[PDB]
Write an enzyme that holds these catalytic residues in place. Structure first.
Site, short mmCIF file in Angstrom:
data_model
loop_
_atom_site.label_atom_id
_atom_site.label_comp_id
_atom_site.label_asym_id
_atom_site.label_seq_id
_atom_site.Cartn_x
_atom_site.Cartn_y
_atom_site.Cartn_z
N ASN A 111 5.18 6.31 3.38
CA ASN A 111 4.54 6.96 2.25
C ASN A 111 4.26 8.43 2.53
O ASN A 111 3.31 9.01 1.98
CB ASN A 111 3.24 6.24 1.89
CG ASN A 111 3.41 4.73 1.83
OD1 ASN A 111 4.32 4.22 1.18
ND2 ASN A 111 2.54 4.01 2.53
N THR A 112 5.06 9.06 3.38
CA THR A 112 4.92 10.49 3.65
C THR A 112 6.29 11.15 3.78
O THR A 112 7.31 10.56 3.42
CB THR A 112 4.11 10.75 4.93
OG1 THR A 112 2.80 10.19 4.79
CG2 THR A 112 4.00 12.24 5.21
N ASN A 156 5.39 -1.83 11.79
CA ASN A 156 4.68 -1.30 10.62
C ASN A 156 5.09 -2.11 9.39
O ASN A 156 5.76 -3.14 9.49
CB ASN A 156 4.96 0.19 10.47
CG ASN A 156 3.83 0.93 9.78
OD1 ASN A 156 3.28 0.47 8.78
ND2 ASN A 156 3.46 2.08 10.32
N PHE A 192 -1.54 8.48 4.30
CA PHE A 192 -2.20 9.11 5.44
C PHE A 192 -3.50 9.80 5.01
O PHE A 192 -3.78 10.94 5.38
CB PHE A 192 -1.28 10.11 6.14
CG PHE A 192 -0.36 9.51 7.18
CD1 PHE A 192 -0.46 8.18 7.56
CD2 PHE A 192 0.60 10.29 7.79
CE1 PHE A 192 0.39 7.65 8.52
CE2 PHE A 192 1.45 9.77 8.74
CZ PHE A 192 1.34 8.45 9.10
N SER A 244 5.56 5.34 8.97
CA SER A 244 4.87 5.20 7.69
C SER A 244 5.85 5.46 6.55
O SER A 244 6.60 6.45 6.59
CB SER A 244 3.70 6.18 7.60
OG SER A 244 3.18 6.23 6.28
N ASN A 287 0.83 -1.19 0.00
CA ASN A 287 0.00 0.00 0.00
C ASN A 287 0.87 1.25 0.00
O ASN A 287 1.98 1.25 0.53
CB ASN A 287 -0.94 0.03 1.22
CG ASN A 287 -0.26 0.58 2.46
OD1 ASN A 287 -0.19 1.79 2.66
ND2 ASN A 287 0.24 -0.31 3.30
N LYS A 314 5.07 3.32 17.32
CA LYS A 314 5.00 2.34 16.24
C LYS A 314 6.30 2.39 15.45
O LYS A 314 6.68 3.44 14.93
CB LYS A 314 3.80 2.62 15.33
CG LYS A 314 3.64 1.62 14.19
CD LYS A 314 2.27 0.98 14.21
CE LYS A 314 2.02 0.13 12.97
NZ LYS A 314 0.57 -0.15 12.77
C1 LIG Z 1 -3.86 -0.29 3.58
C2 LIG Z 1 -3.07 -0.18 4.85
C3 LIG Z 1 -3.12 1.00 5.58
C4 LIG Z 1 -2.39 1.14 6.75
N1 LIG Z 1 -2.45 2.32 7.45
C5 LIG Z 1 -1.74 2.47 8.63
C6 LIG Z 1 -1.80 3.66 9.34
O1 LIG Z 1 -2.49 4.59 8.91
N2 LIG Z 1 -1.08 3.80 10.51
C7 LIG Z 1 -0.30 2.76 10.98
O2 LIG Z 1 0.34 2.88 12.02
N3 LIG Z 1 -0.24 1.58 10.28
C8 LIG Z 1 -0.95 1.42 9.10
N4 LIG Z 1 -0.89 0.23 8.40
C9 LIG Z 1 -0.04 -0.89 8.93
C10 LIG Z 1 -0.88 -1.88 9.73
O3 LIG Z 1 -1.48 -1.20 10.81
C11 LIG Z 1 -0.04 -3.04 10.26
O4 LIG Z 1 0.96 -2.56 11.14
C12 LIG Z 1 0.63 -3.79 9.11
O5 LIG Z 1 -0.29 -3.94 8.06
C13 LIG Z 1 1.15 -5.16 9.52
O6 LIG Z 1 0.10 -5.93 10.04
P1 LIG Z 1 -0.52 -7.12 9.16
O7 LIG Z 1 0.60 -7.99 8.63
O8 LIG Z 1 -1.47 -7.95 10.00
O9 LIG Z 1 -1.26 -6.50 8.00
C14 LIG Z 1 -1.61 0.08 7.22
C15 LIG Z 1 -1.57 -1.11 6.50
C16 LIG Z 1 -2.29 -1.24 5.31
C17 LIG Z 1 -2.22 -2.54 4.56
O1 LIG Z 2 1.65 3.86 9.00
C1 LIG Z 2 1.37 3.61 7.83
C2 LIG Z 2 0.72 4.52 6.91
C3 LIG Z 2 0.47 4.13 5.65
C4 LIG Z 2 -0.20 5.02 4.59
O2 LIG Z 2 -1.08 5.79 5.00
O3 LIG Z 2 0.23 4.87 3.44
N1 LIG Z 2 0.81 2.88 5.22
C5 LIG Z 2 1.43 1.94 6.00
O4 LIG Z 2 1.73 0.83 5.60
N2 LIG Z 2 1.67 2.37 7.28
#
Ligand SMILES: Cc1cc2nc3c(=O)[nH]c(=O)nc-3n(C[C@H](O)[C@H](O)[C@H](O)COP(=O)(O)O)c2cc1C
Ligand SMILES: O=c1cc(C(O)O)[nH]c(=O)[nH]1
Ligand SMILES: CCOC(=O)c1nn(C)c(Cc2ccc(C(F)(F)F)nc2)c1C
Ligand SMILES: CCCCCCCCCCCC[N+](C)(C)[O-]
Length: 368
Positions: A186-187, A261, A117, A184, A113, A232
């Site tokens: 992507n910022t 993350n 944000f 993150s 992804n 995080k």
């Molecule tokens: C589409 C998407 C959006 C995410 N957005 C955030 C986010 O806004 N803030 C954050 O701390 N992590 C974000 N994450 C990371 C997840 O919270 C998580 O830490 C990561 O996906 C690993 O967990 P998983 O393997 O179960 O997916 C995002 C992940 C995905 C796939």
């Molecule tokens: O903390 C984050 C944020 C994003 C996102 O908003 O693009 N994506 C991640 O995988 N982790």
């Protein structure tokens, strides 16, 4: 509950024909109209856990990024989760990067992804959370359920401490814990993971929360106490950086670290060869678990750990716990397993702990 069965009828169809972000929007829409299933079961008293005095009725929550704006907290929690981390939020709303920005690989049960944000901003999300807290005053299915808030910076911001202080002063009262997101991909965010910068960011966040209390009923959350401060962490670091960060986390006395993350160092998924962003799912588990072990050893087991990364089954959850984690977060599991993620993983973990010779879940924390 037959409702989970009925929902799984459409899971493969969603993965094959419906865009991922649209699938997610559908998920939130169904939950907004109170149409998702309910986990009617009762949680094992031997599966509860805690971080400091924050008590989780079970060890599974929804990670940040799933309900970015808190439009669906009740229904997601009632799927069987004990807590949810809303956000990441920013002082003002952002649309994010251009769509499509989320890509799935079913074969590897992984996701990549580059959302950027996207969220509705601190003000509107604070409104949504206040409404939830009012409903929670009456909803017995939501009693003792925890809500955390992940906070971040707007893209075109240089002083991250400003954005985080605005969010805290706006929504801190309403959160059981605050997650600082400097991971993150992507910022200019992973630059703030530099030891000195991070130590200043943490101590500033923890001062703005303490200042909320000095200006005197106050805590409008589940705990009735000031929110804890989590950090995080991104897994793309060398051993030197991990040691320095662990020292900073111990020096600032944060209450927990979320490991971890998404990662940018995976490249055995041919489908994602041409994509950018962070990878999540099953391909992140081993990386994430090892990272837990390292930080668990580096912080001398003094900082509770919230596990995140490739948790799909009770075995993965026990791996995280036996690596040093006290609670687990799911995200990709909901993508690839539908509504049954919480019920199924709680069932499996309970069986595992009963068979592996554990009196309760807390006994398994650590244990190499
Ligand atoms: C589409 C998407 C959006 C995410 N957005 C955030 C986010 O806004 N803030 C954050 O701390 N992590 C974000 N994450 C990371 C997840 O919270 C998580 O830490 C990561 O996906 C690993 O967990 P998983 O393997 O179960 O997916 C995002 C992940 C995905 C796939
Ligand atoms: O903390 C984050 C944020 C994003 C996102 O908003 O693009 N994506 C991640 O995988 N982790
Ligand atoms: C951020 C990434 O989200 C996704 O890509 C995603 N993909 N699926 C199949 C899901 C689960 C899902 C969504 C909707 C439905 C239903 F419409 F059938 F109810 N079932 C399952 C998600 C979430
Ligand atoms: C309602 C009595 C306490 C007053 C101060 C905090 C109010 C916030 C209510 C949120 C819901 C909390 N709880 C425990 C009832 O589920």
């Amino acid at each position: 509950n037959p409702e989970f069965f009925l929902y799984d009828i459409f899971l493969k169809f969603c993965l094959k024909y419906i865009d991922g972000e649209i699938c997610h929007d559908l998920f939130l829409l169904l939950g907004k109209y109170n149409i998702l299933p309910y986990d009617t079961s009762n949680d094992s008293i031997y599966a509860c856990t805690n971080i400091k005095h924050l008590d989780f009725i079970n060890p599974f929550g929804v990670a940040a990024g799933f309900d970015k704006n808190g439009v669906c907290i009740d229904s997601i929690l009632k799927l069987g989760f004990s807590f949810i981390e809303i956000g990441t939020i920013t002082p003002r709303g952002q649309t994010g990067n251009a769509k499509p920005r989320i890509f799935r690989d079913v074969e590897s049960r992984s996701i990549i992804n580059s959302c950027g944000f996207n969220n509705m901003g601190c003000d509107k999300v604070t409104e949504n959370l206040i409404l939830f807290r009012k409903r929670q005053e009456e909803d017995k299915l939501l009693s003792k359920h925890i809500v955390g808030v992940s906070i971040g910076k707007n893209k075109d911001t240089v002083n991250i401490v400003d954005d985080l202080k605005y969010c805290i002063n706006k929504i801190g009262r309403y959160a059981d814990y605050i997650a600082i997101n400097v991971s993150s991909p992507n910022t200019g965010l992973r630059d703030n993971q530099e030891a000195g910068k991070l130590k200043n960011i943490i101590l500033s966040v923890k001062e703005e929360i303490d200042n909320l209390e000095k200006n005197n009923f106050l805590w409008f959350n589940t705990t009735k106490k000031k929110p804890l401060v989590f950090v995080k962490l991104a897994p793309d670091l060398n051993q030197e950086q991990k040691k320095e960060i662990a020292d900073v986390l111990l020096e600032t006395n944060i209450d927990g670290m979320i490991i971890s993350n998404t990662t940018t160092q995976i490249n055995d998924i041919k489908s994602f060869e041409n994509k950018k962003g962070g990878v999540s799912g099953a391909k992140l588990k081993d990386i994430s678990t090892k990272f837990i072990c390292e930080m668990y050893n580096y912080t001398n087991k003094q900082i509770p750990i919230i596990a995140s990364g490739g948790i799909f089954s009770g075995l993965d959850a026990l791996e995280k716990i036996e690596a040093g984690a006290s609670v687990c977060q799911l995200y990709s599991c909901l993508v690839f397993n539908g509504m049954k993620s919480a019920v199924q993983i709680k069932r499996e973990l309970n069986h595992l702990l009963y068979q592996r010779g554990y009196y309760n879940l807390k006994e398994a924390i650590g244990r190499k």
